[PDB]
Design a binder for this molecule. Sequence first.
Ligand SMILES: [Zn+2]
Ligand SMILES: [Zn+2]
Lengths: 119, 113, 272
Amino acid sequence: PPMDYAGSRPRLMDHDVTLEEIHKFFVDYMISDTLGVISTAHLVHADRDPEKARSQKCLELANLHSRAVDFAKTGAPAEMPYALKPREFPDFLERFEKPTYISESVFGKLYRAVKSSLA
Amino acid sequence: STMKFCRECNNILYPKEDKEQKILLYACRNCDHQEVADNSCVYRNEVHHSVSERTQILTDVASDPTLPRTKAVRCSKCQHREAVFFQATARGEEGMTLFFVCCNPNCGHRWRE
Amino acid sequence: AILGLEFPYEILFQLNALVHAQKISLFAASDMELIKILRGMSLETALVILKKLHQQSSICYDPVFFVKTQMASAYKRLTEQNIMSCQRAYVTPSKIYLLGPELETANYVVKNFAEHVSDFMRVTFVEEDWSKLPANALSVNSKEGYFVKPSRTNIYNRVLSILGEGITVGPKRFEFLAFSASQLRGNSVWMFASNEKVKAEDIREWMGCFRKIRSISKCAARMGQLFSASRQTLIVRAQDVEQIPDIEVTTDGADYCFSDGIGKISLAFAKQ
Ligand SMILES: [Zn+2]
Ligand SMILES: [Zn+2]
């Protein structure tokens, strides 16, 4: 079954826009903008933990990603937890400075095949 | 809940209404003196709940209820399930929005719905 | 105030872009001789020599010697391929970098305001390395009291002041119009220089009335949604518009709507 598509409650003001709260929202968009890291964390967790997209962690990550996508529409921050950070990346990434771990998933096999073909 | 003493005999005055005069008047039964009233006020009491005097400390009247607690919601900074939820208005928004306060003594994190 | 003359805006903007780039220092282009030479000449030749100097591989020390040794269509481009010269500006916590009149695809807002082609400027807030601003540089968290409360940094106030007061470049002062959905995710915003003919508020009210929206994010999204690249077509009045009712299904206590943005078109309209 698909996940619920119900969004957050809209926020309505009691006064018209004075061209200041819009600036506040625009500046606050940079803060707590975790749209680009949720996908990476989900991919890392799927590659590490077997039986991916079945545990509650994947569901929580999907809900957080949906909320982050909805952030551009409604002012609901994603609120990325600290304990959900991967702190590890597979071979098929450009984060050379970050620690690299050998992945044994299908993506790891595909990357190894590509590396062998190139070499 | 107001009283005044007439200058003629220094005795209490009771309010009365006259149909012909159509104005508030104060006269006492002690002496014969009628005086004009001021502000047309005969009763003014601030509403208070101090009825059970010297009894609210022994028996808990529950004047200030405690906020409810839930365990379904999971905190973000820490992995603690217990949290406090309540409804309150925002700075400028309308309606009631659900809030959450973490119950972990070492977390101290609050977030909205 | 140093110039105090009728110096053109385009040449001044090009000179500012040259100064911002690592080509000519500030004092090397602030002398009286250079502005005296560049004041009265041919505009096209001046633009050509300025862009040639911009194309210099190394840093130029003497611009006077270089410039001594060196010596309508916009509407058609917009109607053909929507080609416009839009100024792009980068705002950093330390300074501001002006890229210059880079060619880019034109949007809808400039179709009916093509005369003020130079008044539109794209402003992007980046770091010193022209990268995205880290979350730690804005609103750093601090534990004060029983609960943690974020503390706004000086960069936050600087960005607010830049957005409010605006950016002044020569005899112009750019004002905030709106920002598109794509620009919101890239920290970009449109700015328009107010003029005696049309001001920023005039364009804002010409686009539509946004006082009906009471949501901060929704109002910004609706104001910035009309900035995508498009091809101009014929004009249709508001006399022949249908109001076909939609269909809604409510199952399991959930509101499911089939028709979200679907519509109906005819064959003649498609041919036209
Ligand atoms: Zn008396
Ligand atoms: Zn917590």
